């Protein structure tokens, strides 16, 4: 693609510049180019990839929700305004699906299969679950939901065997899987149970951590607690 002529290190450098400039579409394109060089990604590089695409799809998801809400209102004594709301919601939806398909394609070709360490494999499987979850949010679907579930479950199984309960990757995975249960899978009790158990097992392991690791873990634990407060 268009990044084929740029050095891997230059793509990484420019991804960091793009982040500083809040140019997340550029950041994602640079990181896609870096992945396509075919080498494995370091921890920092994995995080750049994740930040870039999370910001891109996050803006698409927010736009899609605005347009979907307008579309649902039009379908209630509502005056007919023609096909335009549906058309434009479909346009944004198709672009969102394209970004998800792009990320899933990078994971399948070939990030996941080359990821042998727990930290990398769990990271990528969580990403797979997340981007299938974003596809599920707009799907009208059972197979997409099962694909998200399967990726999250494999990541959970590895994380429980290979990582301590305070590990930020493990915590963020559990957080997002709990959101999947609550918002996608119609399983609020599973969401609540997962969030509670994750929080409590992390609490009990905080004593092993340095000041900096304690800050990292407790930040994510607070999101679990915020959700539990919303859900109960």
């Amino acid at each position: 693609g268009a990044m084929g002529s740029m050095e891997r290190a230059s793509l990484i450098q420019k991804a960091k510049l793009a982040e500083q400039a809040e140019r997340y579409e550029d950041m994602a394109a640079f990181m896609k180019g870096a992945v396509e060089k075919g080498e494995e990604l370091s921890c920092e590089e994995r995080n750049l990839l994740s930040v870039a695409y999370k910001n891109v799809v996050g803006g698409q998801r927010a736009a899609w929700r605005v347009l979907s809400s307008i579309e649902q209102k039009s379908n209630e004594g509502s005056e007919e305004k023609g096909p335009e709301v549906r058309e434009y919601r479909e346009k944004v939806e198709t672009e969102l699906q394209g970004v998800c398909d792009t990320v899933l394609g990078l994971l399948d070709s070939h990030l996941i299969k080359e990821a042998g360490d727990a930290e990398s494999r769990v990271f990528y499987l969580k990403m797979k679950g997340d981007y299938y979850r974003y596809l599920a949010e707009v799907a009208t679907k059972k197979r997409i939901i099962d694909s998200a579930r399967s990726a999250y479950q494999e990541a959970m199984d590895i994380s429980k065997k290979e990582m301590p309960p305070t590990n930020p990757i493990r915590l963020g995975l559990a957080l997002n899987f709990s959101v999947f249960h609550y918002e996608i899978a119609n399983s609020p009790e599973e969401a609540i149970s997962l969030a509670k158990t994750t929080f409590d097992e992390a609490m009990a392991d905080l004593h092993t951590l340095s000041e900096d690791s304690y800050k990292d873990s407790t930040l994510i634990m607070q999101l679990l607690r915020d959700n539990l407060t919303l859900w109960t």
Partner: peptide
Amino acid sequence: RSRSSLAT
């Protein structure tokens, strides 16, 4: 309203 992992 549910919070997922931060974009960062």
